[PDB]
Amino acid sequence: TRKCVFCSKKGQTIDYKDTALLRTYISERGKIRARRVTGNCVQHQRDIAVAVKNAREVALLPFGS
Amino acid sequence: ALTAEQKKEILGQYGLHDTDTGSPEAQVALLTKRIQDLTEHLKVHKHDHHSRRGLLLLVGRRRRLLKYVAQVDVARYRSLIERLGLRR
Amino acid sequence: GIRKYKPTTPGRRGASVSDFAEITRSTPEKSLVRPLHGKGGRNAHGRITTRHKGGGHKRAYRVIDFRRHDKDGVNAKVAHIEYDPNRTANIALLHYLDGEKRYIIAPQGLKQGDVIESGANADIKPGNNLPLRNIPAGTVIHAVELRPGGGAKLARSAGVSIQLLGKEGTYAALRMPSGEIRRVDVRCRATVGEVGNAEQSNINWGKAGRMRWKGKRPTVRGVVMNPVDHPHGGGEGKTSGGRHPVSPWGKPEGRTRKPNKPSDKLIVRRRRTGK
Amino acid sequence: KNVPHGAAHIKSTFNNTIVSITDPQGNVIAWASSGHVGFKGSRKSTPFAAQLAAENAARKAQEHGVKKVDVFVKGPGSGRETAIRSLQAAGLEVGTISDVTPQPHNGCRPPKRRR
């Protein structure tokens, strides 16, 4: 298990706006991976989940293309 | 839920002094304002059983506090019940 | 809402009514009343045109602004939502700014105090009549007309009214209560919102006096009819007629819709029931 | 007729596999199935039946005159790789492979369990 990046206070804030942090965590098919793979944190990936799925709803990331 | 402005207004305006906050008078005042406000809300929202649980809990809590006030002093109990205009 | 009546008498045991708590005035405007009478189910010629109806309780008539087009750009507050029995729905009088009061169909959930506009600038609160140029596709509509300015005829059922589907070219598509789609001009007049008295379907009739009052006559079953009077007539005992049911007027069950109407080309398909 | 580029559509079930060759616009040219090949029952579910269906589709498409195709695959695995290998070896060149399998978002309700 690797480091959870967003528990850093120097890390950027998590939101639906930053498509770079959005698509660094989504698969080429268009899917969100597991904690076991990513090494990241739980409330953290809850924040990513809400942000990225909100972006997907506002049609910023594909629906499993 | 009450917020800072009206809640401090109530605690001061029914407070015995300008500093006390946990007095039974202020406690009953907060409980009564909460129950009327959220009962007005539930007059619109019918099937909120999880909130009717809050109704019943706060009401039983209120009943315990009113019983304590009546036990400790009849005069203060009568003054409180008359100033709020309730039945018991 | 709905109030059920207690069984004081064996007759009114089941009678339940929709109590009209939505009433504000009791004596209708005397200026707008026109002379009317129960026709008794008969034409001026004297023959009974349609049986099972006629007689009853003589009632008055009042002009409803079904086709509201003459005055636009002026607001109107809901004067008084009164009760007109000549319709399933209710009529709510309006004080228009010019002082000319007309009755209109009262939509669902209308109470005294709302401001109603009739024209292009009208908003989406119910009671606003406006052509399809100024309405979103998908909104529930009622009192729908058929041409730009010839008087509105359809979509006045209490509780379920026509729903707009979409606009293409110069023709607009309307969804029927039956589940059907009708092609209509994009410039016809239509209102927004369902019509009130949705609980009226929960009315329980109650007895025969109410019904002679309402207008209908008792129904005479064909199986006891006389054979000369009816194809189901005759028999010693209870018999169904020995053949499929037929109106005694000659034709049995089946197609009755004569095609080739001018709006037949303006219909996509016919109603299908029980799906 | 004639067409420069085509599209190959393959679907495989637990008991069947059918192949159709279509234009990128969706205009089909030819279709082939193991049932049309001549297998009956579960004999139709075999990968060799997929081979025969693929070669029949490839031949019937090459009289029509298609050179370049892309393959779309869907359905549970019975013979994906074997079928695409047969299609490639039949003389056609594949550009891209894409797996577009219909997946519901808990839409409707799946049938009862098998016992």
Next chain:
Amino acid sequence: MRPYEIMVILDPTLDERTVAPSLETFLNVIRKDGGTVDKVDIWGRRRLAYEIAKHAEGIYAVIDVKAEPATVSELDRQLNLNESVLRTKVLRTDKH
């Protein structure tokens, strides 16, 4: 009097210049009612993930709003009624 985040997507048939007058006219109702503060930034012409309303592209506009829930609901009702808009939403900038 709570900070709100709103994003509006418009049909690409409208040019980039008209967006600013349209948005300021839309939010004048909140400007004139609650005495509010706003911030506007613009970026458009991005390739959409899929077809929406049979369209392939659009323009994005994000506004930070400090206003009344009644005012923001009124803006939502007035704006989603428009045909040139495609998709919109409102969120809370604060904890909740």
Next chain:
RNA sequence: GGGAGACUGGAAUUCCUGGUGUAGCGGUGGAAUGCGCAGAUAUCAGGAGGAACACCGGUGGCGAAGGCGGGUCUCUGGGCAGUAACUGACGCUGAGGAGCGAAAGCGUGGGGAGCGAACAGGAUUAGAUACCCUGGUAGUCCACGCCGUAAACGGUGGGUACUAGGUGUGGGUUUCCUUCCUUGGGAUCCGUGCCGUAGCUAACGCAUUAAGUACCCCGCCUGGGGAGUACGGCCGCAAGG
């Protein structure tokens, strides 16, 4: 993911419409009832409608318990840490009583894509009124009422005080190697998994989230059938409880 109302999104199934496209498509251990040659299957374009939210999603969170998860808004409950300002015996459990409550079932009025009791055929067997296949009526959805039962399980009522640890997770306060990035190290309280002492238990086993050692109150049991049944009483329109 605590609850309620409203708005909204995509994928999928089915159906309809229009191309293309040919003799099969669906099915199981094998085959036939099923739909096609009136143009099926397949595939592209469009539309319609109903249900439910795959990934995140876990032996994780919340709720008193049933249970709860597509987003957005609106209003609201409960719980947790620190300062400890104030009330100064207000605490606990609670017979009878009252409120909530899985699914199925009932009335009224709507909805009804998929799924699916009942019922038809096809199949196996000496025999199938089942397991299997093709169809599909209630129901499954919505609103208002109802019945109030589940292996409603942690098969363990709640509250309080005390009694060795180790290993994960979540939430919040602090301090120190200090980059002061770091599941770095330490202190603290709450929740939730696993293994284990002493101890208890007939055994399996529990083991600070006790079945350990006690205190307070409440319900329940006194061999198996008869029987959770008859009568009587109460509730429910009835099924019934």
